[PDB]
Design an enzyme around this catalytic site. Structure first.
Site, PDB file in Angstrom:
ATOM      1  N   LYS A  41      -0.768 -12.740  -0.668  1.00  0.00           N
ATOM      2  CA  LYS A  41      -0.092 -11.631  -0.217  1.00  0.00           C
ATOM      3  C   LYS A  41      -1.005 -10.971   0.874  1.00  0.00           C
ATOM      4  CE  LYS A  41       1.813  -6.997  -0.947  1.00  0.00           C
ATOM      5  NZ  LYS A  41       2.605  -6.002  -2.112  1.00  0.00           N
ATOM      6  N   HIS A 119       9.012   1.065  -3.182  1.00  0.00           N
ATOM      7  CA  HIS A 119       8.426   0.190  -2.028  1.00  0.00           C
ATOM      8  C   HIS A 119       7.358   1.194  -1.552  1.00  0.00           C
ATOM      9  CE1 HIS A 119       8.207  -1.379   1.816  1.00  0.00           C
ATOM     10  NE2 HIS A 119       8.516  -0.349   2.444  1.00  0.00           N
ATOM     11  N   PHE A 120       5.986   0.514  -1.144  1.00  0.00           N
ATOM     12  CA  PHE A 120       4.948   1.325  -0.580  1.00  0.00           C
ATOM     13  C   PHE A 120       5.081   1.146   1.161  1.00  0.00           C
ATOM     14  CE2 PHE A 120       0.972   3.406  -0.641  1.00  0.00           C
ATOM     15  CZ  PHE A 120       0.650   3.174   0.533  1.00  0.00           C
ATOM     16  N   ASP A 121       5.508   2.220   1.708  1.00  0.00           N
ATOM     17  CA  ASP A 121       5.675   1.974   3.297  1.00  0.00           C
ATOM     18  C   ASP A 121       4.332   1.852   4.197  1.00  0.00           C
ATOM     19  OD1 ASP A 121       8.002   1.184   4.780  1.00  0.00           O
ATOM     20  OD2 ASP A 121       7.765   3.287   5.485  1.00  0.00           O
TER      21      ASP A 121
END
Length: 124
Positions: A41, A119-121
Protein backbone atom coordinates in the site's frame (compact mmCIF):
# COMPACT_ATOMS: atom_id res chain seq x y z
CA UNK A 1 -15.69 -10.34 6.76
CA UNK A 2 -13.97 -7.45 8.54
CA UNK A 3 -16.19 -4.41 9.00
CA UNK A 4 -15.27 -1.01 7.55
CA UNK A 5 -14.98 0.25 11.14
CA UNK A 6 -12.61 -2.53 12.17
CA UNK A 7 -10.51 -2.08 9.05
CA UNK A 8 -10.17 1.60 9.90
CA UNK A 9 -8.90 0.65 13.36
CA UNK A 10 -6.55 -1.84 11.82
CA UNK A 11 -5.23 0.49 9.15
CA UNK A 12 -5.03 3.76 11.01
CA UNK A 13 -5.22 3.48 14.84
CA UNK A 14 -2.08 3.30 16.99
CA UNK A 15 -3.15 4.17 20.56
CA UNK A 16 -0.20 2.14 21.92
CA UNK A 17 2.35 4.86 21.17
CA UNK A 18 2.16 8.64 21.24
CA UNK A 19 4.46 9.07 18.26
CA UNK A 20 6.72 6.96 15.95
CA UNK A 21 9.95 6.27 17.97
CA UNK A 22 12.30 5.40 15.05
CA UNK A 23 12.51 5.60 11.31
CA UNK A 24 11.48 1.88 11.21
CA UNK A 25 8.03 2.51 12.65
CA UNK A 26 6.40 2.43 9.19
CA UNK A 27 8.14 -0.68 8.02
CA UNK A 28 7.13 -2.53 11.17
CA UNK A 29 3.51 -1.22 11.39
CA UNK A 30 2.64 -1.57 7.72
CA UNK A 31 3.71 -5.19 7.95
CA UNK A 32 2.20 -6.06 11.35
CA UNK A 33 -1.19 -4.55 10.40
CA UNK A 34 -1.25 -6.65 7.23
CA UNK A 35 -1.13 -3.68 4.81
CA UNK A 36 1.55 -5.24 2.57
CA UNK A 37 -0.07 -8.65 2.32
CA UNK A 38 -1.24 -8.44 -1.29
CA UNK A 39 0.78 -5.46 -2.49
CA UNK A 40 2.70 -2.52 -1.02
CA UNK A 41 0.00 0.00 0.00
CA UNK A 42 1.71 3.21 -1.16
CA UNK A 43 0.64 5.58 1.58
CA UNK A 44 -0.86 5.18 4.99
CA UNK A 45 -1.36 7.34 8.06
CA UNK A 46 -1.44 6.12 11.64
CA UNK A 47 -3.15 8.11 14.43
CA UNK A 48 -1.67 8.07 17.94
CA UNK A 49 -4.70 8.98 20.02
CA UNK A 50 -7.38 7.03 21.83
CA UNK A 51 -10.18 5.45 19.84
CA UNK A 52 -12.78 7.59 21.56
CA UNK A 53 -11.01 10.85 20.54
CA UNK A 54 -10.87 9.65 16.93
CA UNK A 55 -14.46 8.50 16.96
CA UNK A 56 -15.42 11.90 18.29
CA UNK A 57 -14.29 13.51 14.97
CA UNK A 58 -17.52 12.23 13.49
CA UNK A 59 -19.31 14.93 15.48
CA UNK A 60 -16.81 17.73 14.72
CA UNK A 61 -16.45 19.87 11.61
CA UNK A 62 -18.32 18.59 8.57
CA UNK A 63 -16.27 19.12 5.37
CA UNK A 64 -16.27 17.72 1.85
CA UNK A 65 -13.96 14.72 1.38
CA UNK A 66 -11.34 14.91 -1.36
CA UNK A 67 -13.68 12.98 -3.70
CA UNK A 68 -16.70 15.23 -3.12
CA UNK A 69 -18.56 13.17 -0.54
CA UNK A 70 -20.24 15.19 2.22
CA UNK A 71 -19.68 12.69 5.05
CA UNK A 72 -16.18 13.85 5.99
CA UNK A 73 -15.29 15.54 9.32
CA UNK A 74 -12.28 17.51 10.32
CA UNK A 75 -10.90 17.34 13.83
CA UNK A 76 -11.13 20.47 15.94
CA UNK A 77 -7.67 19.70 17.42
CA UNK A 78 -4.38 18.58 15.95
CA UNK A 79 -3.56 14.92 16.60
CA UNK A 80 -0.31 13.00 16.71
CA UNK A 81 0.00 11.17 13.40
CA UNK A 82 2.55 9.11 11.54
CA UNK A 83 2.71 9.36 7.81
CA UNK A 84 4.05 6.34 5.92
CA UNK A 85 5.18 6.69 2.33
CA UNK A 86 6.63 4.05 0.08
CA UNK A 87 10.32 4.56 -0.65
CA UNK A 88 12.10 4.41 -4.02
CA UNK A 89 13.61 1.07 -2.81
CA UNK A 90 10.27 -0.56 -1.95
CA UNK A 91 9.82 -3.86 -3.88
CA UNK A 92 7.05 -6.35 -3.10
CA UNK A 93 7.13 -8.25 -0.86
CA UNK A 94 9.80 -6.11 0.77
CA UNK A 95 7.68 -2.91 0.99
CA UNK A 96 9.78 -0.08 2.38
CA UNK A 97 8.54 3.11 3.90
CA UNK A 98 9.56 6.52 5.01
CA UNK A 99 8.24 7.51 8.42
CA UNK A 100 7.14 11.12 9.05
CA UNK A 101 5.78 12.14 12.48
CA UNK A 102 3.54 15.20 12.65
CA UNK A 103 0.80 16.95 14.69
CA UNK A 104 -2.06 17.75 12.34
CA UNK A 105 -5.75 17.92 11.99
CA UNK A 106 -7.29 14.73 10.58
CA UNK A 107 -10.23 14.38 8.17
CA UNK A 108 -12.19 11.08 8.17
CA UNK A 109 -15.35 9.85 6.40
CA UNK A 110 -18.00 8.49 8.83
CA UNK A 111 -20.75 5.90 8.35
CA UNK A 112 -23.40 3.96 10.20
CA UNK A 113 -24.86 3.53 13.60
CA UNK A 114 -22.83 4.06 15.75
CA UNK A 115 -21.58 6.67 13.25
CA UNK A 116 -17.79 6.06 13.22
CA UNK A 117 -14.77 6.62 11.02
CA UNK A 118 -14.54 4.19 8.09
CA UNK A 119 -11.95 6.04 5.99
CA UNK A 120 -8.91 8.31 6.45
CA UNK A 121 -9.22 11.19 3.98
CA UNK A 122 -6.32 13.53 4.77
CA UNK A 123 -4.38 15.47 7.33
CA UNK A 124 -4.26 19.24 7.31
Amino acid sequence: KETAAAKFERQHMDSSTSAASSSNYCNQMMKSRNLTKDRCKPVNTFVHESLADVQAVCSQKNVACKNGQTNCYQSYSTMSITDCRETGSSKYPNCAYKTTQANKHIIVACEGNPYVPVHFDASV
